[PDB]
Amino acid sequence: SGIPGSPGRQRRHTLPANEFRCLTPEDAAGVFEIEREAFISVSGNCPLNLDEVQHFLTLCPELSLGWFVEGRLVAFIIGSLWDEERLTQESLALHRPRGHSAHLHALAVHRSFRQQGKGSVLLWRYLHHVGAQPAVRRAVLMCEDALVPFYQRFGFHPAGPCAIVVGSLTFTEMHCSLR
Amino acid sequence: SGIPGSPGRQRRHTLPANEFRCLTPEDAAGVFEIEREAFISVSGNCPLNLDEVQHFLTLCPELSLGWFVEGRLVAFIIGSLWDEERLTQESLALHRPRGHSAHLHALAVHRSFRQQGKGSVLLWRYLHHVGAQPAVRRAVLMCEDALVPFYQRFGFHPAGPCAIVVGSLTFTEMHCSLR
Amino acid sequence: DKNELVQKAKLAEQAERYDDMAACMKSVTEQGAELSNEERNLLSVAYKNVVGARRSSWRVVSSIEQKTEGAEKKQQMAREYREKIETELRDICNDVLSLLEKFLIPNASQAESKVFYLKMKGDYYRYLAEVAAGDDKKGIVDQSQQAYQEAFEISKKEMQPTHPIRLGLALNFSVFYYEILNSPEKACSLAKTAFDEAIAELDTLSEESYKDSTLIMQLLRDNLTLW
Amino acid sequence: DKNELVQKAKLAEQAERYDDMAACMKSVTEQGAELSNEERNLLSVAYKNVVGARRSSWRVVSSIEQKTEGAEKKQQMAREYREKIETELRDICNDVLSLLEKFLIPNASQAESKVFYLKMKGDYYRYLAEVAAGDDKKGIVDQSQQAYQEAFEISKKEMQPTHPIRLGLALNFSVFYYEILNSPEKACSLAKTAFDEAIAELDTLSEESYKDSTLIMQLLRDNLTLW
Numbered sequence: 174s175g176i177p178g179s180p181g182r183q184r185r186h187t188l189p190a191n192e193f194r195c196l197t198p199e200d201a202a203g204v205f206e207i208e209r210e211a212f213i214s215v216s217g218n219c220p221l222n223l224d225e226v227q228h229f230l231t232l233c234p235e236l237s238l239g240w241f242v243e244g245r246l247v248a249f250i251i252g253s254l255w256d257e258e259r260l261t262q263e264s265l266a267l268h269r270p271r272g273h274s275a276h277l278h279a280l281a282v283h284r285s286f287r288q289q290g291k292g293s294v295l296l297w298r299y300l301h302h303v304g305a306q307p308a309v310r311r312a313v314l315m316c317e318d319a320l321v322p323f324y325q326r327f328g329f330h331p332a333g334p335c336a337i338v339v340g341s342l343t344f345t346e347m348h349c350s351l352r
Numbered sequence: 353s354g355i356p357g358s359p360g361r362q363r364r365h366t367l368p369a370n371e372f373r374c375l376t377p378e379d380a381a382g383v384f385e386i387e388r389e390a391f392i393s394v395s396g397n398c399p400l401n402l403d404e405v406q407h408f409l410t411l412c413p414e415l416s417l418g419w420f421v422e423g424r425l426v427a428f429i430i431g432s433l434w435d436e437e438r439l440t441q442e443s444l445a446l447h448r449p450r451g452h453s454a455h456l457h458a459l460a461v462h463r464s465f466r467q468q469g470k471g472s473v474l475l476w477r478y479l480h481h482v483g484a485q486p487a488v489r490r491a492v493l494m495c496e497d498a499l500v501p502f503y504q505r506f507g508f509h510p511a512g513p514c515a516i517v518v519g520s521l522t523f524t525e526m527h528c529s530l531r
Numbered sequence: 532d533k534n535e536l537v538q539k540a541k542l543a544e545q546a547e548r549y550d551d552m553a554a555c556m557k558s559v560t561e562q563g564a565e566l567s568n569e570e571r572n573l574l575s576v577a578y579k580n581v582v583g584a585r586r587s588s589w590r591v592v593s594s595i596e597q598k599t600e601g602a603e604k605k606q607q608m609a610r611e612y613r614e615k616i617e618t619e620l621r622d623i624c625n626d627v628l629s630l631l632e633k634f635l636i637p638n639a640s641q642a643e644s645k646v647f648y649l650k651m652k653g654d655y656y657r658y659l660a661e662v663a664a665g666d667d668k669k670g671i672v673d674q675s676q677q678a679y680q681e682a683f684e685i686s687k688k689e690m691q692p693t694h695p696i697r698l699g700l701a702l703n704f705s706v707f708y709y710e711i712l713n714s715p716e717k718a719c720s721l722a723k724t725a726f727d728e729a730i731a732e733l734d735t736l737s738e739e740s741y742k743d744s745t746l747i748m749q750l751l752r753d754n755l756t757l758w
Numbered sequence: 759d760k761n762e763l764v765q766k767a768k769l770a771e772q773a774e775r776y777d778d779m780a781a782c783m784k785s786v787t788e789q790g791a792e793l794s795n796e797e798r799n800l801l802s803v804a805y806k807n808v809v810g811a812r813r814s815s816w817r818v819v820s821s822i823e824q825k826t827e828g829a830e831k832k833q834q835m836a837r838e839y840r841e842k843i844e845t846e847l848r849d850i851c852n853d854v855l856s857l858l859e860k861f862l863i864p865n866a867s868q869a870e871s872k873v874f875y876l877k878m879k880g881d882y883y884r885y886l887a888e889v890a891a892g893d894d895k896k897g898i899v900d901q902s903q904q905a906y907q908e909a910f911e912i913s914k915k916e917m918q919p920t921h922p923i924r925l926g927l928a929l930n931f932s933v934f935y936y937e938i939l940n941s942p943e944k945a946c947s948l949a950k951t952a953f954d955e956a957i958a959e960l961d962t963l964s965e966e967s968y969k970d971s972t973l974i975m976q977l978l979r980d981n982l983t984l985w
């Protein structure tokens with residue numbers, strides 16, 4: 174926070190303008206509120222509940238990223254590290270510090286900002302953000318069939334059925350090579 | 353190292369153009385070299401010998417900073433943390449992790465780049481770099497009387513005789529408040 | 532074509548060429564049609580970036596200038612360059628202020644839009660105020676305050692304490708009091724009240740209680756901690 | 759005034775306004791006097807920054823362009839914007855290349871200066887080659903290679919293996935072979951030989967060994983590790 178002439182002093186804040194930031198545990202409520210609309214309203218299920226969301230943001234916030242429109246969180250990606258080729262049920266609530274794959278637990282864009290290319294900018298951004306981390310050689314996520322062609326535009330490849338079941342839902346596993 | 357479209361891949365390097373970087377242990381030989389010309393030739397003594405320089409760069413490279421002119425190191429500042437109000441003899445070879453003051457052990461500009469304002473840009477830069485670090489509330493250094501008026505231009509204040517003797521040399525202590 | 536301009540604008544934002552992005556959004560605004568929320572964000576972001584660049588260069592060349600003690604000539608170099616930057620800065624402000632007065636505020640149908648553009652009006656007069664001198668200053672500072680005040684007024688009536696736009700205005704308006712008006716106490720009141728009311732609404736557990744503006748709140752408390 | 763221009767140039771560098779810094783150094787160069795090492799660095803840095811900005815925007819708008827799915831939908835927008843950026847990029851390169859041909863290389867009295875400006879000549883033709891369209895490309899790539907080759911020639915004769923300028927040329931020249939010429943093997947030879955020779959000289963512990971170019975060497979090995 175540059176104050177020319179005053180080295181250790183931090184400059185006051187004013188409203189920012191579109192930025193990408195790691196999410197904080199305090200941003201958890203805003204995530205779950207988007208998840209209510211985005212996931213819970215269609216399937217009656219969602220990737221992470223508030224507690225689970227807060228967990229990953231306290232444990233590994235650097236594996237998360239959100240697009241903030243002038244201070245408002247409108248799109249996110251909550252992740253953690255995994256240490257196996259395939260995703261398993263138990264990996265939903267696990268973060269493996271010495272893992273090698275960035276496990277994207279949830280990705281969602283606020284309904285009033287969808288179809289503007291913002292979800293893609295975020296995903297691309299996230300792949301670069303985590304790809305830069307010296308141990309993360311791959312990215313993994315599960316999605317329903319409809320979103321498979323979408324994710325292939327980012328380098329993800331179909332890895333068949335995902336061993337993870339959420340409620341009464343089944344998904345296709347996707348793998349994306351990075352470093 | 354941005355490769356649009358390839359998230360985990362690092363872009364190839366080409367010659368850079370003027371930058372400020374933390375020094376690495378490998379930059380120690382270049383540091384001692386400037387010190388031979390810059391100090392050993394006038395007083396027959398110098399702040400840090402190669403071993404001592406290498407030590408600080410391995411232990412706390414984040415407390416160091418150099419101006420690199422297109423890949424060439426031409427000016428540096430080797431530092432470490434101190435945890436007392438006044439500098440003592442033993443603080444010359446000491447780095448205190450939980451310290452609160454950035455102890456500038458040596459500051460020098462290559463003879464072919466002096467009087468261009470580059471030493472000032474570096475010092476200012478260093479005060480911002482270390483001042484940003486959450487525990488570093490002050491900066492401390494010793495210099496001969498001639499340089500006292502110079503250091504006051506950066507916020508340093510005369511703190512009387514320094515308790516540290518190098519060879520047959522005595523210096524004035526300087527303190528600079530940061531955060 | 533309006534679409535092409537928006538498409539090129541979103542392109543320039545990614546290419547990090549904000550002066551281009553602003554030019555595109557300035558053209559879209561000049562077709563007299565009310566901007567969509569997206570187009571509005573694009574315009575705000577383009578300009579916040581275009582001007583912020585100059586503001587940053589200004590602060591540094593000013594610092595350098597006041598630190599050039601003795602050297603009359605080296606100090607005059609910074610003086611002239613700073614002025615060169617101030618003209619650039621002045622033009623940018625007048626640009627958006629004109630856009631505001633001619634298309635943005637007149638077309639503002641909703642209160643959310645009215646407060647956004649009114650805040651934006653206070654914003655640019657503030658930036659203009661950061662470099663003003665002479666008698667021009669007293670006037671600029673009033674212009675800023677009156678736009679901010681009107682937005683604040685509407686904000687209190689039509690927006691929830693946790694609304695991102697209501698909260699954003701709180702932040703900028705309190706900073707206006709703090710550094711432009713030198714009124715620490717009032718500045719802190721503005722900020723604390725806003726933060727506390729937002730916290731109050733959230734403590735009720737309502738789906739309506741935004742939770743989107745977490746950042747603007749952290750920003751507010753940081754400023755408080757600072758002051 | 760030459761001094762004022764340099765003073766304003768050092769000012770613009772700090773203010774991060776590299777287009778101004780370049781303009782200042784372009785004027786100094788246009789007074790036909792040989793540049794001091796400082797003025798030379800200032801010119802190199804101004805331009806390396808001015809052009810790097812456009813190169814970066816180019817890479818991103820190009821990526822976006824091929825990615826673009828569908829037909830000539832907004833595929834044509836990126837295409838045009840990319841071309842707009844290419845013209846800007848082209849102009850910058852012709853600017854320094856002209857400066858080089860008219861004042862810089864003709865005034866180069868020492869070999870250190872001759873290799874610096876010759877490398878800089880290869881550099882800008884390389885940047886020009888990165889956006890070179892079809893038939894114009896062949897010629898540009900020869901122009902780059904010939905300047906690089908001449909500099910390399912002089913480098914081997916008048917500079918120590920550890921010299922920052924000799925080493926800098928090694929890096930840029932090997933990358934030229936790697937991505938502009940698609941010659942991995944030759945690219946790696948250039949880089950490896952340069953690194954090894956530098957290491958050799960440092961190994962004899964002699965007084966003439968540089969140790970100022972540590973970074974350029976790490977850069978060289980990183981590239982090797984990469985390839």
Ligand SMILES: CC(C)(COP(=O)(O)OP(=O)(O)OC[C@H]1O[C@@H](n2cnc3c(N)ncnc32)[C@H](O)[C@@H]1OP(=O)(O)O)[C@@H](O)C(=O)NCCC(=O)NCCSCC(=O)NCCc1c[nH]c2ccccc12
Nearest residue numbers: 219220279280281282287288289290291292293316319323
């Ligand atoms: C999809 C997304 C992020 C795109 O953003 P955007 O709207 O900004 O999109 P852009 O504008 O950037 O791009 C638009 C493109 O997105 C694609 N797309 C968008 N909607 C689509 C759809 N309905 N079907 C197929 N492709 C579609 C298209 O290809 C479309 O191109 P076209 O214009 O050519 O069609 C955004 O629309 C959003 O937040 N959606 C709701 C939440 C969600 O689904 N998260 C992804 C879960 S997949 C990842 C994940 O979170 N897994 C956890 C797995 C999970 C655990 N529990 C669950 C419970 C329920 C569901 C899932 C889970």
Ligand SMILES: CC(C)(COP(=O)(O)OP(=O)(O)OC[C@H]1O[C@@H](n2cnc3c(N)ncnc32)[C@H](O)[C@@H]1OP(=O)(O)O)[C@@H](O)C(=O)NCCC(=O)NCCSCC(=O)NCCc1c[nH]c2ccccc12
Nearest residue numbers: 397398399458459460461466467468469470471472495502
């Ligand atoms: C001084 C410095 C860094 C400025 O850089 P520059 O040349 O780029 O300067 P700028 O262009 O940025 O600014 C120029 C200004 O620098 C000041 N200045 C420069 N030379 C001066 C001089 N001889 N006397 C008084 N003021 C002078 C002036 O005020 C001058 O303004 P004027 O234009 O108005 O005069 C640069 O010239 C340099 O590397 N010098 C040699 C090494 C050194 O002395 N390190 C400082 C040791 S004091 C810190 C330190 O390392 N302590 C360890 C203590 C130590 C332990 N063992 C030792 C053995 C011997 C000596 C010291 C030690």
